[PDB]
Design an enzyme around this catalytic site. Structure first.
Site, short mmCIF file in Angstrom:
data_model
loop_
_atom_site.label_atom_id
_atom_site.label_comp_id
_atom_site.label_asym_id
_atom_site.label_seq_id
_atom_site.Cartn_x
_atom_site.Cartn_y
_atom_site.Cartn_z
N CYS A 89 24.77 -8.19 -9.76
CA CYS A 89 25.21 -7.89 -7.65
C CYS A 89 26.56 -9.77 -7.18
O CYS A 89 27.37 -9.70 -6.69
CB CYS A 89 25.03 -6.78 -7.18
N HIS A 113 25.34 -10.17 -0.35
CA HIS A 113 24.31 -11.39 -0.74
C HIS A 113 25.92 -12.34 -0.06
O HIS A 113 26.84 -11.35 -0.65
CB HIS A 113 24.80 -10.75 -2.37
#
Lengths: 338, 338
Positions: free
Chosen positions: A126, A252
């Site tokens: 990710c 993120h």
């Protein structure tokens, strides 16, 4: 199309996002199957049986989206592929396999995806994934040669356990929070379990297991290197990454210093990224703004004066680690396959 | 010694830490004066008058520790200096002045501190300060030539207003926190005031005002460059910094990629830093561990393979922005002066 699709690991966070996204694209309930292990889940006006991933018969399935961990994937992805299923795996199991394309949907699908002798396409990390639609565009323009990356990683990347660890610590200490201004050990944190230190009201520069190679890097630090190389098709790309956990639920973020083979100005970078697929140019990218949307947010683009002749940039990216970072990319690959 | 010391801006967070630290060194109450503006504060068994910084007579004072903002410092530091007071200023007012030494106590005191024709010593930026006792040691060994820095900045650096903004947002949304896993806009945040976006459960890659020079950098981004140069005495040091705010009360952290003029291994870096003044070598530095202690925490030291021949490191630092980053350093300078 009459396409038949399965989700393996349907009850996890990623599985849930896959289901939401399949729905949000009006995919027929009649052409969907769910799998887990050790009984019915609603999907668009129907209740779907949660089959057993290990023993169920995969034939009939055109595509299976796996988000069930690597151990399960090592065994079950070949079994599904043997039954003629194209497997898109959101785990680390097949990422290092030279016969498995590691694909960001708008980056290297055409280049890599068609060559899958094992019937498997691997879904990238990710953290790396969030940077890829951004870096691809800059790479195509100027040739990317070096990355320095520091991440700001949300807890949902660790599954439900990360979410609970953050929430429970925050709830436990919120009452006396201001005391942390003068004494970081003033309060009583519920003992960490998933992470090496408390995460609420903290940052933790350690994500993953230390690789047994004398480097001092974690597997997550190294994914930034290995996966960027494979995805961008730059086998010798220079990468130094530091993965750091922050008290964020989803989203993120990456502070990226990127060096190119020719000059690339912030203005030109902005012009290229403004057009780009899967990218949104913003002044100040944040994980809160990224959480729940599809594009990578990018901004704070500056020249890095440490690179001669304007060949270096500093830029900042935020992206949803459950959506583009996991579920969405697998579905975008599935769309491109069909 | 019979030394006489004043604190200007005694009621702020930094002022409070100065007072705590003067006490924790058993400094006589009888030799201390407090100043603010627009009435008594306890200090070691006595109640001390809070004088008016603008109109009070500074003579008698040997040293004044200022933490009252830059506007006040521009006017009052010369007035105090005119009265024979050595001023140590925790503000940005005199940092760029070529006749004012910019001093980290264990770094450039001997080199720079004695030359003060304006009677003023400037206290460095907290974010830069945390890295200085670490980088000095590595620089002395191998010659530092380039920095890439991404910060993780606590809110107490913004004074009480940052603390309150974080606490009030966290309290307002904590109840529905898990919804942020799927939708960063699910909850009702009290509107940001100090920061450009919500800080609780977020990261915000914007600290400071955008410098009016076409760079896209903030004044805080640029402090990492200007102040590192002045403090380390490397006028041409290459620096690229990105200041990012995180939901932490106290404790600034820095992910640093440092390049040297000769090879420097992680092992050798660890060996040098283990000895070092104002430094503590740890596996995983965190702001919670740093908050309330004096040393800079350093660890996660790795080779940066993007620099040829082992001349590059990646390392992580956490330090208390109110202590070493502000109050403590001024007091350490005062000790060295006397």
């Amino acid at each position: 199309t009459g396409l038949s699709i399965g989700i393996v690991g349907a009850t996890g966070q990623v599985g849930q996002v896959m289901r939401t996204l399949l729905d949000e694209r009006d995919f027929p309930a009649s052409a969907v199957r769910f799998f887990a292990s050790a009984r019915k889940l609603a999907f668009r006006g129907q209740e779907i049986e949660v089959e057993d991933a290990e023993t169920a018969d995969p034939s009939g399935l055109d595509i299976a989206l796996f988000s069930a961990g690597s151990a399960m994937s090592k065994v079950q992805a070949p079994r599904f592929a043997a039954a003629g299923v194209t497997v898109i795996d959101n785990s680390s199991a097949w990422r290092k396999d030279p016969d498995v394309p590691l694909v960001v949907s708008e980056v290297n699908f055409e280049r890599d995806a068609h060559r899958r002798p094992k019937g498997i396409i691997a879904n990238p990390n990710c953290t790396t994934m969030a940077a890829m639609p951004v870096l691809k565009v800059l790479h195509d323009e100027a040739r990317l040669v070096r990355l320095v990356v520091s991440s700001y990683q949300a807890v949902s990347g660790s599954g439900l356990a990360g979410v609970a660890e953050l929430a429970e610590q925050a709830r436990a200490v919120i009452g006396g929070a201001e005391q942390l201004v003068y004494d970081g050990g003033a309060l009583e944190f519920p003992p960490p379990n998933t992470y090496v230190a408390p995460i609420a009201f903290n940052v933790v520069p350690l994500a993953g297991s230390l690789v047994d190679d004398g480097s001092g890097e974690t597997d997550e630090d190294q994914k930034l290197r290995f996966e960027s190389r494979k995805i961008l098709g730059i086998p010798d790309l220079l990468v130094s990454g530091t993965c750091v956990r922050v008290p964020v639920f989803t989203g993120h973020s990456l502070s990226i210093n990127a060096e190119f083979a020719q000059p690339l100005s912030p203005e030109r970078a902005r012009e290229l990224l403004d057009g780009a697929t899967g990218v949104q140019l913003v002044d100040v990218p944040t994980p809160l703004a990224a959480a729940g949307v599809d594009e990578s947010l990018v901004g704070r683009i500056r020249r890095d004066p440490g690179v001669p002749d304007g060949r270096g940039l500093a830029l900042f990216v935020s992206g949803d680690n459950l959506r583009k970072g996991a579920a969405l990319n697998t579905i975008q690959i599935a769309e491109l396959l069909t």
